[PDB]
Design a protein around this ligand. Sequence first.
Ligand code: HEM
Ligand SMILES: C[C@H](CCC(=O)O)[C@H]1CC[C@H]2[C@@H]3[C@H](O)C[C@@H]4C[C@H](O)CC[C@]4(C)[C@H]3C[C@H](O)[C@]12C
Ligand SMILES: C[C@H](CCC(=O)O)[C@H]1CC[C@H]2[C@@H]3[C@H](O)C[C@@H]4C[C@H](O)CC[C@]4(C)[C@H]3C[C@H](O)[C@]12C
Ligand SMILES: CC(C)(C(=O)c1cccnc1)c1cccnc1
Length: 472
Amino acid sequence: VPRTVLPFEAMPRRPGNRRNRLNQIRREQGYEDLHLEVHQTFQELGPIFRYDLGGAGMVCVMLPEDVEKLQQVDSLHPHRMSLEPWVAYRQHRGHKCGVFLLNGPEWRFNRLRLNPEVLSPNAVQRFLPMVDAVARDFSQALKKKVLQNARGSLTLDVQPSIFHYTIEASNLALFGERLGLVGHSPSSASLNFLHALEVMFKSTVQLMFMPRSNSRNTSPKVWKEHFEAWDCIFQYGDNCIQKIYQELAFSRPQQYTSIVAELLLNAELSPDAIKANSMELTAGSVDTTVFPLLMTLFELARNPNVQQALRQESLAAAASISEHPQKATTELPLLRAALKETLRLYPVGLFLERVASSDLVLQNYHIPAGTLVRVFLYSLGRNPALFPRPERYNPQRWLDIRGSGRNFYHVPFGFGMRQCLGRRLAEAEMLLLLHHVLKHLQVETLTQEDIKMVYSFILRPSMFPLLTFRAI
Ligand code: HEM
Ligand SMILES: C[C@H](CCC(=O)O)[C@H]1CC[C@H]2[C@@H]3[C@H](O)C[C@@H]4C[C@H](O)CC[C@]4(C)[C@H]3C[C@H](O)[C@]12C
Ligand SMILES: C[C@H](CCC(=O)O)[C@H]1CC[C@H]2[C@@H]3[C@H](O)C[C@@H]4C[C@H](O)CC[C@]4(C)[C@H]3C[C@H](O)[C@]12C
Ligand SMILES: CC(C)(C(=O)c1cccnc1)c1cccnc1
């Protein structure tokens, strides 16, 4: 690094030895306010600091310029601190690890053979009609509940139905199957699969935060629950892959039907590798897309001028998107901007993480090779220097957006070759559900109070309010 950069020792340090009630806050609520605690530290120390704990020091950053510098020192296979409970399940049952868990050349081999079928513009053009079909079914089911309510309006908890929508849409894109989670009586097999997804994620978070001194005897029931949930998920995956094998051998269609069928036809990855990646993509919808979809509905309820501008756009584009759902990618610029605005205020992952593959420089400080660097998305999005009136929900800011490093202003899906593999499937699900709902319905909430987010592996709303829908 240049001789003019400040030494690592000069970086502002978060005091580890202050007298305050953090000790007691940890006893009572653990790390549930970590986003706010780190945000306060950036306010005090500036946009880079060393978080000292247990003899170690994580570098905390929050600027687009830092994300750009990290993308520069990404290797051909950026290192990931693999989710241990998920790895342990694969080790125990003799399943492969997929891109969520792999490192090194094996990660890259897998990733390059998935990108064209999941992340590419061509992949999106193929799956958009399937996501559109599920979005229509969800939107029609809600409109029907509204129009049959005695009170001319429907106040409901939308959290379960929006979650079910994301699983239904993703599972259709991946395996070409409808679980039926829009019906009032979905099959026991579909509900068992959904339950297993929920238990898998809940048990992941319980195991990651299991104290060392309690693992021997508190963890075995949780490990059992985790592995039994994964067994159910892998049974569903095997069932779908066997069905696809049968279709491709004896009844092969000319047209695209599913991401997994395309991977099996390509035959670049082994069947066991395709299953592992399909199960990780399956898991990728659990407790992710639901949150920005909910928070977009919440902010549209609070910002009726923005809601009406999005409704005008969706009504003007409605005919074009009905003819070719693929048009949703270019004909709803303000709604795409609204998704960026939701994720600016309400990231799902709290941070992006890299281990410095080489010495580098961030904010004119020398960063030694091997340093843990975390980009805190909550703080990046609330920087008033880059996002004037950062508390304001203003999708127009993205159509206006200026500044040198503007490519790195929107990074809630990460960056570079190890960015979120599911990002375009997540984006399409959010875009099309909101498009179809806004054409038919208006949303409100009783109070305009900010939602409290809690950090529990992901950032999630504490007490998401009932929403009220009415016909337009
Ligand atoms: C709004 C919803 C979501 C957000 C904000 C999100 C965000 C992220 C982020 C930040 C990463 C790490 C990227 C990096 O370090 O550069 C990631 C990885 C990943 N995400 Fe997502 N994600 C979401 C939804 C999904 C969905 C729906 C799927 C699957 C259908 C998915 C599949 C994955 C996979 C497989 C990886 C690992 C990629 C790899 O390591 O090669 N994600 N996501
Ligand atoms: C290391 C810890 C406690 C060890 C002890 O003090 O006895 C034990 C408790 C539960 C154990 C895990 C559970 O038995 C579930 C898994 C069982 C597999 O046979 C090994 C990995 C596996 C993931 C185990 C790893 C490790 O041995 C754990 C985590
Ligand atoms: C930063 C914080 C410690 C802060 C403090 O004691 O002041 C630590 C303690 C436990 C850590 C978490 C746990 O190790 C569980 C998770 C492990 C994953 O690899 C990253 C996220 C993950 C959710 C961790 C994030 C973060 O490093 C946590 C929350
Ligand atoms: C939200 C979460 C946990 C995420 O931000 C993440 C996942 C892997 C690595 N880094 C961040 C995630 C989880 C599943 C799919 N995509 C994203």
